[PDB]
Amino acid sequence: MENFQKVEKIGEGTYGVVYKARNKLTGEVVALKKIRLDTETEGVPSTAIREISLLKELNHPNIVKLLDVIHTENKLYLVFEFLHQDLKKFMDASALTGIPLPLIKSYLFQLLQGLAFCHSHRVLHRDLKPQNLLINTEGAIKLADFGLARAFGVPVRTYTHEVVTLWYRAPEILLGCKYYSTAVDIWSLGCIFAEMVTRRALFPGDSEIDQLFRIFRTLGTPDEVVWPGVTSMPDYKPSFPKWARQDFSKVVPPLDEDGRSLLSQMLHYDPNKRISAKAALAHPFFQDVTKPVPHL
Amino acid sequence: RRXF
Amino acid sequence: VPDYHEDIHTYLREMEVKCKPKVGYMKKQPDITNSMRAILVDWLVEVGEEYKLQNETLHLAVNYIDRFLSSMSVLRGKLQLVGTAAMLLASKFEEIYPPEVAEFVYITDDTYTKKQVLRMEHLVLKVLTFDLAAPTVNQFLTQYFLHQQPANCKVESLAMFLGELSLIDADPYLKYLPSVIAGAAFHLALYTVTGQSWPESLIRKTGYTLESLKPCLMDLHQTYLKAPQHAQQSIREKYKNSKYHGVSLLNPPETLNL
Numbered sequence: 001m002e003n004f005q006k007v008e009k010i011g012e013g014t015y016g017v018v019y020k021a022r023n024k025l026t027g028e029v030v031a032l033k034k035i036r037l038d039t040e041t042e043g044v045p046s047t048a049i050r051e052i053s054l055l056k057e058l059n060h061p062n063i064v065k066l067l068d069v070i071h072t073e074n075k076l077y078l079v080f081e082f083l084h085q086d087l088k089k090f091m092d093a094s095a096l097t098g099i100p101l102p103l104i105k106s107y108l109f110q111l112l113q114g115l116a117f118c119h120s121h122r123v124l125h126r127d128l129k130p131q132n133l134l135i136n137t138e139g140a141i142k143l144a145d146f147g148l149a150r151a152f153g154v155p156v157r158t159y160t161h162e163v164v165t166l167w168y169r170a171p172e173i174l175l176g177c178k179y180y181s182t183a184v185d186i187w188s189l190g191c192i193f194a195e196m197v198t199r200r201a202l203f204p205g206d207s208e209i210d211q212l213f214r215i216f217r218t219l220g221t222p223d224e225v226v227w228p229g230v231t232s233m234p235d236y237k238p239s240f241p242k243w244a245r246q247d248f249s250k251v252v253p254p255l256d257e258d259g260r261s262l263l264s265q266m267l268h269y270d271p272n273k274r275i276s277a278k279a280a281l282a283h284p285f286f287q288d289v290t291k292p293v294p295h296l
Numbered sequence: 297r298r299x300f
Numbered sequence: 301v302p303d304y305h306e307d308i309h310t311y312l313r314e315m316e317v318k319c320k321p322k323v324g325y326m327k328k329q330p331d332i333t334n335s336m337r338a339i340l341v342d343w344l345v346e347v348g349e350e351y352k353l354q355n356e357t358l359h360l361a362v363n364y365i366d367r368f369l370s371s372m373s374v375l376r377g378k379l380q381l382v383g384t385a386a387m388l389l390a391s392k393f394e395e396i397y398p399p400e401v402a403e404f405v406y407i408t409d410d411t412y413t414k415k416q417v418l419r420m421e422h423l424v425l426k427v428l429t430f431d432l433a434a435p436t437v438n439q440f441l442t443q444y445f446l447h448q449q450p451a452n453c454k455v456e457s458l459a460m461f462l463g464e465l466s467l468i469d470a471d472p473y474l475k476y477l478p479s480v481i482a483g484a485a486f487h488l489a490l491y492t493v494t495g496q497s498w499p500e501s502l503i504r505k506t507g508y509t510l511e512s513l514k515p516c517l518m519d520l521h522q523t524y525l526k527a528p529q530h531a532q533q534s535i536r537e538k539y540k541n542s543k544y545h546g547v548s549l550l551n552p553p554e555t556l557n558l
């Protein structure tokens with residue numbers, strides 16, 4: 001830590017504060033995450049355990065790079081490549097004009113690449129949200145914050161009390177599935193795709209039931225035809241109202257036929273039929289993908 | 297249990 | 301989604317080689333023995349039962365112990381400290397919420413302090429260089445179970461039993477990668493329950509013929525035959541539960557037809 005000068009606080013992640021820092025010997029600018037570390041009572045938090053072990057395994061252009069781990073008696077620091085902004089804050093600043101469609105396409109393409117790489121290496125991110133998606137000045141976007149990530153060499157059991165996020169949560173979790181699958185990450189990314197396009201959260205629920213119901217109002221209340229098994233899932237109720245599926249030309253007006261098609265496949269109700277990240281990369285929507293740079 |  | 305079944309298996313096959321312990325490390329430990337290790341692992345089986353931990357957590361903890369003891373000499377009075385920190389770390393990695401640290405002090409009958417446990421945690425992270433996502437027998441078995449025609453829950457439970465038994469005895473089981481032990485455990489379980497044999501679909505996928513599994517299998521057959529007389533009995537007691545269809549009450553075949 002002697003070779004780093006803290007410049008400023010840039011944010012917070014899972015159980016740690018993130019600083020912009022510079023290496024005084026090499027000149028490199030890094031992002032330093034200082035883990036909240038209680039040395040007498042609980043030790044190294046499970047978020048830092050998972051983030052370190054999983055990110056050391058994951059070397060990809062669209063996943064944030066862990067450069068180094070500095071582990072002393074009373075402090076734990078993670079050294080990352082520095083990235084300039086998060087997606088949440090970028091879209092707040094691009095509200096009114098909107099993020100240009102070509103840049104939306106590029107970001108989605110890149111996020112799918114990073115996600116596909118995670119999944120092929122048995123890592124579930126589990127908490128994809130714009131605040132965890134990081135951008136640089138050169139047009140790259142990267143997955144960040146692997147604190148809630150899990151290795152799925154054996155299937156991951158769902159949390160009784162979900163800590164993950166309401167708005168980007170898959171309907172199978174809300175209805176009480178016993179395990180996560182890679183499909184939960186596709187669902188979140190579909191929500192983020194729609195959010196970039198329309199300039200607002202697709203499903204801004206205020207509770208779990210309201211979250212389900214906001215999904216039902218846009219996508220239609222699911223049944224055995226659309227989602228075999230749904231009516232015998234732990235938290236399914238026959239008293240659920242019946243809403244009609246909305247035309248995606250109303251849900252995401254700016255988006256063309258290919259975009260609407262991919263979206264609907266990323267928001268498929270049945271986790272077994274929801275499109276995979278690898279398959280999504282083959283979709284015709286990415287035929288004309290380019291790499292524009294954002295105005296930060 | 298203490299254990300060797 | 302089964303789009304990554306192959307990729308994941310291939311990737312686990314690659315990582316199990318990297319997370320492998322040194323095979324002859326106990327010979328170079330001057331104060332501890334295979335037999336002590338066996339007592340330690342057996343105790344951890346029981347701890348996972350008391351605290352209703354997942355079986356993967358046990359498998360992970362053992363992997364962490366053997367890799368730690370591969371580079372660090374440990375006196376017999378501290379071996380339990382190593383195990384306890386391993387189980388804490390595995391629980392943190394694998395469990396939805398781990399038992400509190402205090403619970404890990406209590407399970408040793410307060411032979412160590414909370415601070416000792418936490419600083420052993422730090423030391424284990426240092427020596428393992430934070431590489432905790434190790435493939436296990438339990439992971440390979442879980443993936444092999446997708447190839448049952450049809451799925452049979454005695455087979456699964458008995459294969460898990462046999463997998464766990466192998467954690468207890470460093471000689472011979474440290475010789476074998478987890479995918480190989482899982483292979484032998486699955487065949488022997490399938491054979492024991494139905495008389496069937498290591499399926500061609502798994503021969504294509506693993507690239508393991510039954511013949512290549514033979515050395516590990518003969519070891520595992522003897523272990524299974526001699527399980528009721530073994531000094532360590534926690535796994536047997538564990539698998540008597542209705543949860544597991546009593547498999548450890550089924551009778552082992554006196555011959556493998558090999």
Ligand SMILES: Cc1nc(N)sc1-c1ccnc(Nc2cccc([N+](=O)[O-])c2)n1
Nearest residue numbers: 011012013031080082083084085086145
């Ligand atoms: C490792 C890491 N985890 C996060 N969570 S953010 C983070 C990180 C890594 C690299 N660069 C950045 N920079 C950055 C810039 C702007 C905003 C935010 N944010 O935390 O709000 C982060 N943040």
